Each structure stands twice: as structure tokens, then as C-alpha cells.
Write a protein that binds this DNA or RNA. Sequence first.
DNA 1: AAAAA
DNA 2: AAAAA
Lengths: 420, 420
Amino acid sequence: PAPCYDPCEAVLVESIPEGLDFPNASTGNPSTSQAWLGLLAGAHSSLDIASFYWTLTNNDTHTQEPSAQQGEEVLRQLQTLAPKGVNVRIAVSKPSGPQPQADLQALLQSGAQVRMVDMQKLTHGVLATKFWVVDQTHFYLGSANMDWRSLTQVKELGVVMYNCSCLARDLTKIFEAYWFLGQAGSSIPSTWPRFYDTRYNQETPMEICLNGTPALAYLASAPPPLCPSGRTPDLKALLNVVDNARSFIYVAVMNYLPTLEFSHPHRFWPAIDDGLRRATYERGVKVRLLISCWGHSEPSMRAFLLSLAALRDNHTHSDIQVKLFVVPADEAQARIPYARVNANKYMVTERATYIGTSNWSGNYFTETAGTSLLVTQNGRGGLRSQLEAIFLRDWDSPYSHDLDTSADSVGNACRLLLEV
Amino acid sequence: PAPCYDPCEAVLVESIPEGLDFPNASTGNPSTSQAWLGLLAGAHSSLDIASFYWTLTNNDTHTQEPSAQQGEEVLRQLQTLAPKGVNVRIAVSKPSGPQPQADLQALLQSGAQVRMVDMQKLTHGVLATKFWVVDQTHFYLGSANMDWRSLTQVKELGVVMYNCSCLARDLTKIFEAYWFLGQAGSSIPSTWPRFYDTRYNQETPMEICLNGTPALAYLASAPPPLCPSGRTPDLKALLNVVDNARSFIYVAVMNYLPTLEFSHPHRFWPAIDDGLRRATYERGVKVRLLISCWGHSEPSMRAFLLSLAALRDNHTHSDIQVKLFVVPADEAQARIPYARVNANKYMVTERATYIGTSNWSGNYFTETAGTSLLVTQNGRGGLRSQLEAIFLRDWDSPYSHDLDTSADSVGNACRLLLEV
DNA sequence: AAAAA
DNA sequence: AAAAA
Ligand SMILES: *[C@@H]1O[C@H](CO)[C@@H](O[C@@H]2O[C@H](CO)[C@@H](O[C@@H]3O[C@H](CO[C@H]4O[C@H](CO)[C@@H](O)[C@H](O)[C@@H]4O)[C@@H](O)[C@H](O[C@H]4O[C@H](CO)[C@@H](O)[C@H](O)[C@@H]4O)[C@@H]3O)[C@H](O)[C@H]2NC(C)=O)[C@H](O)[C@H]1NC(C)=O
Ligand SMILES: *[C@@H]1O[C@H](CO)[C@@H](O[C@@H]2O[C@H](CO)[C@@H](O[C@@H]3O[C@H](CO[C@H]4O[C@H](CO)[C@@H](O)[C@H](O)[C@@H]4O)[C@@H](O)[C@H](O[C@H]4O[C@H](CO)[C@@H](O)[C@H](O)[C@@H]4O)[C@@H]3O)[C@H](O)[C@H]2NC(C)=O)[C@H](O)[C@H]1NC(C)=O
Ligand SMILES: *[C@@H]1O[C@H](CO)[C@@H](O[C@@H]2O[C@H](CO)[C@@H](O[C@@H]3O[C@H](CO)[C@@H](O)[C@H](O)[C@@H]3O)[C@H](O)[C@H]2NC(C)=O)[C@H](O)[C@H]1NC(C)=O
Ligand SMILES: *[C@@H]1O[C@H](CO)[C@@H](O[C@@H]2O[C@H](CO)[C@@H](O[C@@H]3O[C@H](CO)[C@@H](O)[C@H](O)[C@@H]3O)[C@H](O)[C@H]2NC(C)=O)[C@H](O)[C@H]1NC(C)=O
Ligand SMILES: *[C@@H]1O[C@H](CO)[C@@H](O[C@@H]2O[C@H](CO)[C@@H](O)[C@H](O)[C@H]2NC(C)=O)[C@H](O)[C@H]1NC(C)=O
Ligand SMILES: *[C@@H]1O[C@H](CO)[C@@H](O[C@@H]2O[C@H](CO)[C@@H](O)[C@H](O)[C@H]2NC(C)=O)[C@H](O)[C@H]1NC(C)=O
Ligand SMILES: *[C@@H]1O[C@H](CO)[C@@H](O[C@@H]2O[C@H](CO)[C@@H](O)[C@H](O)[C@H]2NC(C)=O)[C@H](O)[C@H]1NC(C)=O
Ligand SMILES: *[C@@H]1O[C@H](CO)[C@@H](O[C@@H]2O[C@H](CO)[C@@H](O)[C@H](O)[C@H]2NC(C)=O)[C@H](O)[C@H]1NC(C)=O
């Protein structure tokens, strides 16, 4: 494949929730809200948004919180740019219940096309892919739902990638697949049409001029059915990256459960666990795990995390460390539903970086839809170094604790920490 | 296949080392030495012995211990029955070094055919199958090497199965394969001749009148190359038995390491571990692990055992308990090489029983040769109940300790227990 | 934000 | 008894 001769730059945007403060003053990136506002201001031809749910108002949460202001602003911008001529298209998973949808109808009346994709009746899951494609030259990919709490109340990790028409259209292709697949009546085709096929997969990634220095990047999609022949499955890419590492593997994910949740009877899913154990045993790879715990985390997950932190010895030089990153909450933020959590889902090695939109559980890789970006840069510094610095800042943060920490000591309510 | 109309009875023989005493007086079986002596006395037509090594003298150990007397007696019997007309045939793995072999030459001069099978040059391993076939009607299968220490100094678990011409010849077939395969020059055939093929495998086991009540039994062999089309691999049978269980799984094995030992670079082998985790998570199966620790155990093994004992929670009702069975030793028994250990390798469920000759490591299932017996009896009581009683006696014995036990507290030297 | 028999 | 670079 011909290299993409475009000034593809890339910014690691993150939304630090109020209260959280890293006392380093050395790493600084635009927040998710700032990047989204800039993309909307620069949007003049197209805007494709794949989202899980839309809660850009204090109305939909039934809360009176000023912190939603930024989110409301985004909604206002989304209302203003539709009449200007931008072909706004939004794919949002069909809600389980018939709850009112103020934002979606507000954009529909303005002129924004909305299609209700229903993953439950197609592959038995939800559509949890959160990404943007702006003018088909820039794009966004991260853990930020189209919510005000996502912008302010929870922590995110995403990439805004500018001037990359080639990686922007390869990402759209997924949005086009969602658009065609979830309009009405139509089901998953046996064979995907060539329009959705891609050429930049794991064996032949795409060459970009990522800040001048050449780099190899490509996107991975899920669930396996909604995947064309060219596209590399998200699980396969994740396993390849965790296997190719030879020095260290740093993982910061919201939820890591090696089981097929959201289904019964309970099923065991040892896919990422086996890869982590292989990498940490056969090779001297040091594995560092950073999970996030809140009030809506499965208490069984600890029982698996303890199964990994206990595998470390001298003879094979095994080294696995597991830490929980819990976002502190107060009385004011307690009343907000799904208020405080670290939703970042990514990992970084000494030779590659993976940034995804789905938690590390069997559903997100076999049923729930998701998208991830893989970047490998030959050289010292760059995107990989920036993400490694982000992960170490997270790792040494006061909010990151060991698996033996007392739950009451942590500010927020954690179900994975035994009391006293 | 037609059922084997033979009074196939079955005795669980075990060799309790001196010093060990279970204060129950309710379970009693003939020792391995007694059963071997009875088989030799009743031997008049044939005697096939597959063994790892031959140390039936105080000479070969270079020790002066009266406890070898029984072993010497066995050797004497093995010398006496050869001139009587018994076709004694012994398959013993070729030693790494050119050490003297008094017992093998003593039997060779009497008239016992000995063939030096060399597993290292054939499949890259050793021949660790310990079994007897006496007159092709009885047989023995257990963890007892042809050693005096095996008979007295270490603990064993084996089956002597009388009046079973059908299960005796199915076991011989393996000895015939070893005999032909390890004579001289000849290598492993691509396709095994029909003479070594068997009909009683996992899908179609053999029906026997095991103490009157019908039962389904069959044998499994390793390594996968020295296996005909009919024969079921040992690993496949082990996985099937650990998967079919629905209530509990009790495992008492000498060494359980989910790695490919005896080879470099270090390799990860998550085959039995994954099955145990699946059984204990998907179903409410209670898994109890009884490992044995001595002075020649890999210290890394604890790092994996802690990975299993830490997987137990309420939401999925997971329950895995790991215990170490350490045979106490004194100053007198310390000087004996490979003196005190619990060498039993078996497991029992609520519906099946597995008795093997090899430890639970990757080599023993992929390179090292081994044989195991599988029995499933429909009813309450019988062989399965006897083995379950044996396992619970072992589990509650004072010699069985938890993984957090202090090493100095245990009588013997254990490398898997952290000091103080 | 995929917690919700 | 498969501990032995
Ligand atoms: C590849 O090329 C792209 C294109 O330039 C680079 O993207 C730039 O990345 C740098 C650093 O990652 C960004 O610089 C940082 O911007 C942050 C956001 O600035 C906006 O928001 C603040 C909010 O108050 C406004 O005041 C400001 O005017 C902007 O609107 C700043 O917060 C950062 O400052 C932090 O670091 C400095 C030290 O440098 C400290 O003194 C500060 O206190 C603070 O801690 C910083 O300035 C830049 O904005 C990005 N550009 C764009 C267009 O997004 C990629 O980084 C590059 N890739 C690599 C690997 O280098
Ligand atoms: C299917 O059928 C076969 C054929 O009979 C059964 O095999 C018999 O199994 C029973 C019990 O498992 C055996 O009985 C036990 O024998 C032990 C060994 O006895 C020999 O060694 C002692 C050593 O001193 C000699 O004294 C003795 O004369 C024998 O030469 C005994 O040690 C056992 O005694 C224990 O239990 C009793 C209570 O019953 C206590 O009072 C004792 O103190 C001691 O704790 C016991 O007698 C029998 O020997 C086996 N027969 C053969 C030929 O091997 C299978 O058991 C059967 N299967 C099932 C499931 O029932
Ligand atoms: C993506 O590509 C566009 C197109 O090149 C970038 O916009 C360009 O940004 C540069 C500097 O950021 C601008 O250069 C400046 O121009 C002004 C006059 O407009 C001049 O006074 C300055 O000294 C400087 O030279 C350039 O004009 C501008 N071009 C356009 C068409 O907007 C954009 O910055 C790229 N994205 C990122 C994240 O860098
Ligand atoms: C395997 O099969 C052989 C053959 O049947 C069994 O040997 C038989 O054992 C029974 C009792 O154990 C003997 O019965 C006894 O016979 C004597 C006379 O010899 C009699 O006085 C007793 O009252 C009793 O009836 C039988 O004779 C004997 N037969 C032979 C040919 O040895 C053997 O016991 C079986 N194996 C096991 C473990 O049971
Ligand atoms: C919710 O949306 C409505 C209309 O878009 C706005 O407030 C509602 O309408 C009037 C005020 O305009 C009030 O009498 C209603 O009680 C309001 N509804 C609610 C649920 O408060 C406003 O845009 C939104 N309300 C907010 C953000 O509080
Ligand atoms: C063997 O492992 C031990 C601990 O598992 C190592 O000892 C130290 O352990 C602490 C806490 O785990 C570490 O912070 C140190 O870095 C370890 N090393 C030293 C020198 O203090 C020990 O180093 C390992 N290796 C050997 C040869 O004993
Ligand atoms: C070892 O075998 C030899 C011959 O089979 C026996 O003892 C050896 O020979 C004479 C006594 O017959 C002694 O002078 C030697 O010193 C003995 N050898 C050793 C190593 O002691 C006897 O059968 C065996 N020796 C034992 C069991 O101590
Ligand atoms: C939940 O788990 C706890 C412990 O993991 C159970 O509490 C007791 O724990 C001890 C020691 O582990 C056991 O010996 C008891 O059998 C457990 N039960 C009781 C009633 O004491 C607890 O039972 C589990 N279930 C619930 C509903 O809490």
C-alpha cells in the first residue's frame, strides 16, 4: 500500500475530572471538551459520530449540576452546525427501554440524521464504539461517551488525530458499516460488500508521517461478525501487541474480567489472561495492570486480579503488579449517576501502543462492538513515549492503590477492596 | 465392543513409608511390595515390566539401609522365576550416563530379556511408565518405580487389577510398542501397525464386571507420537475427566507445573490450569489440590499454585483449595538420595477416577512417556469411593499443610514454603 | 457508563 | 525420582 503523504499529527486528549490533580505540571494536553469544540468549529463538510448514548443535558440525568455546562455547549454547537450544511450523522445504540431522548430529537429537528442501530437483535450486545470523523480529515477515538459526565465527571483517554484523510476514511468505513447495518429491518450480510473492506490491517499496517517521523498505524474493529475480510479483529490485534512486547507491558483499563459477562450461564474467557501470563513467564516482560474500581464494578473481578498479582517469582523473573485507580468522590458528586470513574482503556509497551474504546471482557470482543487504534513508531520519543509518560503518571498517582488496600481508606466506594 | 466377561477385581495398593501413620484403622490395602510378591509367586507364563530405572539393591544407592530388604527380596524373586520358564521382559529407559547396572545384568544372565529404550533420541524425553503385566491376566499400574525406596521410602498409589485378561492385554500393547520401538536403531514409525492399535478409548470405553457391578474403564498413553490411532492421549483423557465433573475434583499429584520444564527457553503450558479454572468457575465444582513438596521440587511451582488458591469468590461460588503433602524425614533418612516424597499421581471426581504414572507437567504429556487408567462406575461405592476415601484421608492428614505454612514447621525440607 | 435477574 | 546448566 502507498504511504499516506499527509501531515498526520496526533494529540492525546484526556478529561481530568474536577478534584483530580496530578502535581507534575510537566505533561499537558487539551481536554476532550476543548478538542471536540475545536473540531466542531472547524467542521464545515461532514461530521460522523458513533456513540453509545446521548446525555448532553442536565435534563437527561435529572440532575442540577453546573458541570454539565460544557456538555450543553457541545450540544448547542451540534445544533448550530447542522443548518450550516454539515452532513451530521449519528449512530446510537437502541436503548433497552422507551426512555425519552431530548438531545437526539433536538438534533433530528435541526437536520442531523439519526439511525437507531440495535445490537441486541443482531449479534446480542450493545454498540459501545465512541468515535468522531470530522470532515473526513480529522478523527477522534477514545473512551468518551457523548455525555457531559464523560466530558467532566469521569476520566478519559483518547486521540484526536488531525490532517489524516487516510486514517479518517478508514475509520469512517466502520461508521458506514454501522449506518447501513442499523437503519431498519436489514441484518448482518453474510459477506460484507467491498465498500466496507480495508487494506490496512495487522500484517500490512499503514505508513504515516506521524509528526514527521514515519510510523505504522492501523485500526481494529469488533464484534467479529461486523468485520470485513481486510479488517483485523480487536482481540487479535490486542493479543499480537501483548505478545510482541519484550521488556514491559503497561495496561490501564476500566474493567478487566476474563469471563463472558452479560450472559448466562457464566462462561470462562482466558484469552488476554493467557497472553499476559505467557509474556510475563516465557520472556522477562514486566506486566503492570491499572484497573479502575467504582460502585458499579463486579466484585468477582478481584478474584481474578489476585490470580495475576500472585504470579511473580525469581527463577523465571516473573513480575506482574496489579493496581486499582479509584477516582475520589464527595457528597456533591455522589448523587450523580455514573459520576466518578477512570474510563481509560489502553496499553503501552516498549515498541507499540494500543488505544481502545471497550473494556477488557469477553463481551466487548465477541458481541459488543468496539474500535481500537494501534501505533508503532521506530525511534525514541513520540506518541508511544507520551502514552508511557501518561501511564507512569497514573501509576504513581495518589489515587492508584494496591489490591490489599482497605476500601474505607479510598475516597470513593470500591467493591474490589476488602474492608479493614 | 463386546463386554469383557471376566471377574475383573481391583485393589488400590499403596506403600506407606516408615514413620507415616494414619490414625484411622478403617482403610487397609495390601502394600505395593506384598502385591508384587504375590504377582511374582503366581507368575508362571509371562511377566512384562515397564520401568524408569532399576535400583533394587543397597549397592546401587551406595547406602547401607536395612529397609532395602524387601526390594532385594523382589530382585531375588525376579532372579528365581526366570529359569522356571517365565518370559521376563523389561523395558528400561537408557540412562544419561554410563553408570553400572547391577540388577539389569543380574536378570540378563538369568535369562530375562532387557531392551534399552532411549527416549531422548526418539521424542526428546524419558520413559517414566511404571507398570506390570503378569501372565497377561493381572496387571499393575502406579507410581512405583522398580526401586527399594519406591517400595518403602516413598509413598505410592497404584492399582493391582486381577483376573482381567482384556485390560491386561490392552495394557501390554503399550509394552509391546515400547519393546519394538526401543530395541536398536529403529525409530518411531509414521503409522503404527495394527498390532498396537486398540479399540477401548474415551468415546468407547471397555465394559468390565468390576467387583460384579458393571463399570467403564480404559487406558490412556503418552507421548502423543507413541500413540496408535485407537489409543486416547493421556492429556485428552485427563481434560475430559476434569471437564465432566460437576460437584468436586480432588487431585493428588507429586508435581503440578503448567510449564514445559526440562527444556529451554521456558515455555508456558496452560492446559490443565485452564480446565481447572473453567470447571471451578462455570460450574460450582469444588477443586481440591494436594501437591507434594520435597528437596527436589522447583521453587517456581509455588508461584503458580498461589495463582490457583487465590481464585475463590461467592458470586460464582468458586472454591479452589491447594495443600502440600510433605513426607517427614529424619537424620537417618536424610542421607538416602530421593528418600522421602509422596509420589502419588491421581485424581477423583464424583463420577470418575483417574490414576496416572506421570506428574502434571508439560513434558510428561508431550515428550515423556506415561500411562493412566480411567474408571467410571455407575452406582454408590466401589473403586471411586475407595479412592475418594484415600484422598480425604490424605487431605486431613497431619502431613498436609496450607500454602502459607512455615517451612521450618514441616518435618522435611520444602522449597515451596516461605521461611517464617 | 454496558449493572441490573 | 526425571533436578541438575
Ligand atoms: C505532534 O504535533 C501535534 C501538533 O502540534 C502536537 O500537538 C500538540 O501537543 C502539545 C503537547 O502535547 C500541546 O501543547 C500543550 O497544550 C495544552 C493545551 O493547550 C490548550 O489549552 C490551554 C488550557 O488553558 C490553553 O491555555 C492553550 O492556549 C491551548 O488552547 C497545554 O495545557 C500544555 O501546557 C502544559 O505544558 C506546559 C509546558 O509545555 C506547561 O507550562 C503548562 O503549565 C501545561 O502544563 C501544552 O502547551 C499542543 O496544544 C498540541 N497542539 C494541538 C494543535 O493540539 C503533538 O503533541 C505532537 N506529537 C508529539 C509526540 O510531540
Ligand atoms: C473387589 O474385590 C477385590 C478382591 O477381594 C477386593 O480386594 C480386597 O480388598 C480388601 C479391602 O480393600 C482387602 O482387605 C484388606 O487387606 C489388607 C491387606 O491384607 C493383607 O496384608 C495384611 C498385612 O498384615 C495381612 O495380615 C493379611 O493377611 C493380608 O495378607 C488388610 O490390611 C486390611 O485390613 C484393614 O482393614 C480391617 C477392617 O476390614 C482392619 O481391621 C485392619 O486392622 C486393617 O486396617 C483388609 O483386610 C483384601 O485383601 C483385598 N483382596 C485381595 C486379594 O487383594 C477389592 O477391595 C474389591 N473392591 C471393592 C471396591 O470392594
Ligand atoms: C492541519 O492542517 C492545517 C492546514 O495546514 C493546519 O492549519 C494551518 O496551521 C498553521 C499553523 O498552525 C497556519 O500557519 C500560520 O498561518 C498564519 C496565517 O494564517 C500565519 O500568520 C502564521 O505565522 C502561521 O504561518 C496555517 O495558516 C494553517 N492553514 C490553514 C489552511 O488553516 C492545522 O494547524 C493542522 N492541524 C494541526 C493540529 O496542526
Ligand atoms: C482370580 O481368579 C482366580 C481363579 O478363580 C482366583 O483363585 C481362586 O480363589 C478362590 C478364593 O479366593 C479359591 O476358592 C477357594 O478354593 C479352595 C480350594 O482351593 C477352597 O477350599 C475354598 O473354600 C475356596 O472355595 C479358588 O480355588 C481359586 N482358584 C484358583 C484356580 O486359584 C483368585 O482369587 C482371583 N483373584 C482375586 C484377587 O480374587
Ligand atoms: C430541560 O429542557 C427544557 C426545555 O428544553 C428547559 O427547561 C424546562 O422547561 C421550562 C423552562 O424552559 C421549565 O418549566 C421546565 O420545568 C423545565 N424542565 C425541567 C425538567 O426542568 C431546559 O432546557 C432544561 N431544563 C434544565 C436544564 O433544567
Ligand atoms: C529474589 O526475590 C526477592 C524478593 O522476591 C528479591 O529481594 C528483594 O525484594 C524486594 C521486595 O520484593 C525488592 O524491592 C528488591 O528489589 C529485591 N532485591 C533486592 C536486592 O533487594 C531478590 O532480589 C530476588 N533475587 C535474588 C537473587 O534473591
Ligand atoms: C553388592 O554386591 C556384591 C556382589 O553381588 C555383594 O557385596 C560385595 O562383594 C563382597 C561381598 O560379597 C564385598 O567384599 C564387596 O565390598 C561388596 N560390595 C559392596 C559395594 O559393598 C553384595 O551382594 C552387595 N553389597 C551390599 C548389599 O552391601
Ligand atoms: C461469602 O464468603 C464468605 C467468606 O468468603 C462466607 O463467610 C464464611 O467464610 C468462612 C471462611 O471463609 C467459611 O468457613 C464459612 O463457611 C462462610 N460462611 C458462613 C455462613 O460462615 C459467606 O458464607 C459467603 N456467602 C455470603 C452470602 O456471605
